[PDB]
Symmetry: D2
Subunit: 72 residues, 4 copies
Amino acid sequence: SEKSLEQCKFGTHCTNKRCKYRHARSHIMCREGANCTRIDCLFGHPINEDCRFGVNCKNIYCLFRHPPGRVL
Amino acid sequence: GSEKSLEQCKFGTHCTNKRCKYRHARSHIMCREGANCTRIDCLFGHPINEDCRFGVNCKNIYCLFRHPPGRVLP
Amino acid sequence: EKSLEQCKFGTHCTNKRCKYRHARSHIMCREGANCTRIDCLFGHPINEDCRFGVNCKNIYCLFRHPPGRVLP
Amino acid sequence: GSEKSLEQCKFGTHCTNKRCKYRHARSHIMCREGANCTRIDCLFGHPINEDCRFGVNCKNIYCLFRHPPGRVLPE
RNA sequence: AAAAAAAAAG
RNA sequence: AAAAAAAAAAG
RNA sequence: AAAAAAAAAG
RNA sequence: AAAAAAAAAG
Ligand SMILES: [Zn+2]
Ligand SMILES: [Zn+2]
Ligand SMILES: [Zn+2]
Ligand SMILES: [Zn+2]
Ligand SMILES: [Zn+2]
Ligand SMILES: [Zn+2]
Ligand SMILES: [Zn+2]
Ligand SMILES: [Zn+2]
Ligand SMILES: [Zn+2]
Ligand SMILES: [Zn+2]
Ligand SMILES: [Zn+2]
Ligand SMILES: [Zn+2]
Ligand SMILES: [Zn+2]
Ligand SMILES: [Zn+2]
């Protein structure tokens, strides 16, 4: 078994039974962000990939990277 | 003929029933026509006919399940 | 919490809280339907009639078939 | 031509990529034309261009992955 | 080769 | 209570 | 980074 | 309301 701190982009809808990444079960973003070192942490951490839906992405819980100028 | 229903699919974009009869939301925006929307292929959110497991204290602002009165969101 | 009842989706089950038994081998369990090992990975019968009936040709199918279906 | 490919999807009926460009088998029967089949919506099984994880010892008679020579199956 | 690249209000 | 996070640590 | 390379009989 | 009751060879 392998375990990484990198965030799984599929979250609770991941269906890879050998997935080595972290999975969020809360819409709350972890208070430590990308600095969190808890392997089984259930809060959200940033995904290192640009959001397909850009500055106009309407999902306030989205963990992908957005341009500046997007207001929550 | 068609067996499709206006009732909302509780799994949304994560439904993997290849024969699902229900409506699927692909937007986080709630449909402006509400539960009265009659467009079978409408992609906006509509209420699900099932009680939310998380009850009056559910804090997911996109949740489409049914909640008791007095639920408060930020 | 866990049940001896066979999961009808096997390795393709995506219920993260599933309480049923999952076959990871196409070999049928030598103890049959009355096997009581909770983590047994061999096949046991599903409690549902096969949609494909007496003419089902999938030799690994665990659903229920009428007696006229004979496997080579 | 179109974006669709004749290459076989390795996930079959359990594929959940809504943008998948590959061919999907809905039968355990292997296509009589094999890897030479050019029908883009063919539902029968064709060889996958990837080595089987279970190698010469694979006993799944419906497996579409590549195997070493010397694999045997029940007769 | 698994995000809603389906846009109608994204 | 057979596919939602009734898994809680801040929900 | 989505096959059962998880084995007890594969 | 998650099996290929979608068929061309099932
Ligand atoms: Zn994952
Ligand atoms: Zn954390
Ligand atoms: Zn986004
Ligand atoms: Zn559905
Ligand atoms: Zn609508
Ligand atoms: Zn709710
Ligand atoms: Zn299951
Ligand atoms: Zn057993
Ligand atoms: Zn069958
Ligand atoms: Zn072209
Ligand atoms: Zn595919
Ligand atoms: Zn073919
Ligand atoms: Zn194989
Ligand atoms: Zn990565």
